């Protein structure tokens, strides 16, 4: 059981605040669309070895917007996540 890249249809959620240590290995943030990909919405984090499913309303994802902006060596995708930006 693993969530395949860009195949995010998580019916389950981890719901834990992820460790920043492992976060520095989360090269991607993949949005589970509530229709465009799966039948529900989720913010799941794509590590370089795995993907974890997070509840859209989760501080770990919001903090990750801050953290990813200062981590990942400076490599990020085109995420216009301005609807959250810590305010989620």
Curated annotation (Swiss-Prot):
Function: Chemotactic factor that attracts skin-associated memory T-lymphocytes. May play a role in mediating homing of lymphocytes to cutaneous sites. Binds to CCR10.
One GO MF term: CCR3 chemokine receptor binding
Protein's organism: Homo sapiens
Tissues expressing the protein: Testis, thymus, placenta, ovary and skin.
Gene expressing this chain: CCL27
Keywords: Cytokine, Disulfide bond, Secreted, Signal
Keyword Metal-binding: no
Family statement: Belongs to the intercrine beta (chemokine CC) family.
GO cellular component: extracellular region; extracellular space
Range covered out of full length: 25 to 112 of 112
Protein name: C-C motif chemokine 27
């Amino acid at each position: 059981f693993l969530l395949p890249p860009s195949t995010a249809c998580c019916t389950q959620l981890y719901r834990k605040p992820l460790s920043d240590k492992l976060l520095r290995k989360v090269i991607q943030v993949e949005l589970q669309e509530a229709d465009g990909d799966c039948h529900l919405q989720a913010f799941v984090l794509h590590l370089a070895q795995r993907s974890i499913c997070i509840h859209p309303q989760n501080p770990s994802l919001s903090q990750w917007f801050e953290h990813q902006e200062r981590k990942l060596h400076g490599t990020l995708p085109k995420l216009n996540f301005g609807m959250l930006r810590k305010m989620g």
